[PDB]
């Protein structure tokens, strides 16, 4: 299936506060009214320039992503996981199952079978959006958690995404996947292009509205 | 100063812009995030073997 975003995938493109103004930016955005894939419950996707990624549930079936160029050994990759404990970022050379996942006893993690040469570690319904990008050896992640009053369909509205993480890795990326918690006892993928937007800033400094300046003559 | 900026030993009545003025910085300050990690240069320079 395919679906239509309406006004989705807007993130704060810098750390700068702004009071009641209209500011114009050039960056990598998800164009308004786009053609976003639909997935149910998954396969190896491309990256090619950033990614928008939403998801919907009350349980937690979406348990992180895996990135990289080959998703195996012989080249390095990232791995972002969340068991019922908390997030586990990790950067080694792995050996990934071609269909990697984790179970739910509640024993799991048939994800990889190798953790060699680790160069970075870290340990510690609902709509959960994420924007992933990778520039100059930094892997930036923006995110937002809005509550839907549906269960698993893409809604309409405006909600800007706030920066979360910054990782000075150096890693090359060309592909990525997803991770799901099996049954033993809905998600979308947009892509980002270089656009020019007009963001409206509140008096507290939040982005409340935007204009995509390449949609139509009025814009 | 008027005679210099007007290039003349006589000046006529009026008001004349002669120079600018500005306050100079008293000192310098520096701010930066707290302290964390700072690398553990005690494992290689402090090994038992």
């Amino acid at each position: 299936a395919y679906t239509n975003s309406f006004t989705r995938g807007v993130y704060y493109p810098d750390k700068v506060f702004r009071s009641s103004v209209l500011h114009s930016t050039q960056d990598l955005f998800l164009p308004f009214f786009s053609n976003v894939t639909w997935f149910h419950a998954n396969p190896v996707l491309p990256f090619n320039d950033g990614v928008y990624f939403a998801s919907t549930e009350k349980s937690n079936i979406i348990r992180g992503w895996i990135f990289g160029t080959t998703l195996d050994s012989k080249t390095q990759s990232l791995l972002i996981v969340n068991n019922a404990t908390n997030v586990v970022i990790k950067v080694c050379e792995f050996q990934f199952c071609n269909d990697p996942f984790l179970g739910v006893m509640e024993s799991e993690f048939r994800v990889y079978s190798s953790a060699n040469n680790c160069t970075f570690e870290y340990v510690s319904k609902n709509l959960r959006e994420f924007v992933f990008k990778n520039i100059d050896g930094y892997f930036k992640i923006y995110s937002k958690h809005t509550p839907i009053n549906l269960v698993r369909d893409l809604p309409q509205g405006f909600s800007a995404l706030e920066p979360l993480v910054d990782l000075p890795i150096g890693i090359n990326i060309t592909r990525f996947q997803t991770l799901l918690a099996l049954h033993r006892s809905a998600y979308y993928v947009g892509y980002l292009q270089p656009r020019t937007f007009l963001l409206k800033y509140n008096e507290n400094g939040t982005i409340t509205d935007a204009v995509d300046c390449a949609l139509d003559p009025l814009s | 100063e008027t005679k210099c900026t007007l290039k003349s030993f006589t000046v006529e009545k009026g008001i004349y812009q002669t120079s600018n003025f500005r306050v100079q910085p008293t000192e310098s300050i520096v701010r930066f995030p707290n302290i964390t990690n700072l690398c553990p240069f005690g494992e290689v320079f402090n090994a038992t073997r």
Partner: protein, 164 residues
Amino acid sequence: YGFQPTNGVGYQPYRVVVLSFELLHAPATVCGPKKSTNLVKNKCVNFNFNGLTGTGVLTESNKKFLPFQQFGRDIADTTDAVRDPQTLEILDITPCSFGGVSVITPGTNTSNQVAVLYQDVNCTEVNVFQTRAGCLIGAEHVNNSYECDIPIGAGICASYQTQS
């Protein structure tokens, strides 16, 4: 090496560490620990917050950033606020007073007395009389109204009477 404690120097063991700094072609990496001097307020200073470099006078403010926002800027894109990275308090930035200087002359063919106007400057930062055109030094403020002789501005004029 058969090391033994009763060996002359130059035969006793030395431990060696060789640090080798390399610079491939990445985006960045390890660096030194930048210093951090105290933070003053209400004086023209040269500040530096994390790399934000400028000069001016810092006061405390009534803004509220967003937890991830590190400094503010206005229309025309000048920095007019900042967050300091240790208190987590936001501070207003105001340029350090400046202006022009004008001299009021009654004509050198009449006198050598002069008055001085410091344009749009408060009088504290330089008998002494505060106009809306700036701070005026060397002229007496009388209460009568004459025709304008030398225009000062915002309704005020000056003149050489009687002698002053």
